[PDB]
Structures are given as C-alpha cells and as structure tokens.
From a paper:
ZG16 binds microbial pathogens, and lower ZG16 expression levels correlate with colorectal cancer, but the physiological function of the protein is poorly understood. One prominent attribute of ZG16 is its ability to bind glycans, but other aspects of the protein may also contribute to activity. An intriguing feature of ZG16 is a CXXC motif at the carboxy terminus.
Here, we describe crystal structures and biochemical studies showing that the CXXC motif is on a flexible tail, where it contributes little to structure or stability but is available to engage in redox reactions. ZG16 crystal structures also draw attention to a nonproline cis peptide bond that can isomerize within the protein and to the mobility of glycine‐rich loops in the glycan‐binding site. An understanding of the properties of the ZG16 CXXC motif and the discovery of internal conformational switches extend existing knowledge relating to the glycan‐binding activity of the protein.
Residue numbers in the entry: 22 to 163
Amino acid sequence: RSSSYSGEYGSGGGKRFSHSGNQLDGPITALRVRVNTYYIVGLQVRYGKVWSDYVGGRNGDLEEIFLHPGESVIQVSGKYKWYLKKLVFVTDKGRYLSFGKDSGTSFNAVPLHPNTVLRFISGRSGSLIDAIGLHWDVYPTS
C-alpha cells in the first residue's frame, strides 16, 4: 500500500531494464555508477548480497559506494540531455552521493509516501543510461 514510482526520467532509446525481481534478494546495499567524459554510462545495484545484471556501456570509470547497514536512498535527483548526465543519491544517514556533470534537464525524485525508501530501479540502457525510474517502498523486514 506504500509503494510509489518516480519516472521515467530521460529519453526513449535503448532497451528497458527493471530490477523488480531483484527486490527478493534484499534491500539496496551498494551502488555502482560508471561515468565517462560526457554521460552516465552504466549502473549496477547490490540487493542484499547479490549484484543486479549490469546495464549500460563499458566506457568510463566506475565508482562503487557501499551503503552502511540500514542506510537507504530516500531521494534521487539528476540531469539528462539525450542521455543521463548526472545522478545524486541522498541517503537516510545524511549522505549525498553525486555522479556525473551538471548539464541538461533536471529532475528530482522522492517517495510519494512518508517513511519509504528506494527499493529498486528501472529504466532504459544501451551503451549509456538512456532513462531511469525509481521505485519506492517500505524497507524490507526479512
């Protein structure tokens, strides 16, 4: 009853992906974002102890952030122009995790219902991240 969805932010190219099935592996516990000179290139998210299937390209440097136990994302903002250019993940331990460059159209995603967190992502990808959507729900008890 508490789930919500923000998106889809970006353009309509590439191939759809969704981490809806990965929810069963656990809460989000880590993020990988690949970034090149121009764009957000790729994404991988750890659900419990299991990484999602990587989406995006091979170009660029990877950044890997491990969330603390019980830390979740409660806001995702960013920018896109043709493809995703910037992503900012804000956590409920007060951390701001920023990736990419400030150029393009801005978006800001927050959960519709209070006391919910980022449970999974979806979007579109190819050699880059074309679009992103954020799926919010209660933090998992089991």
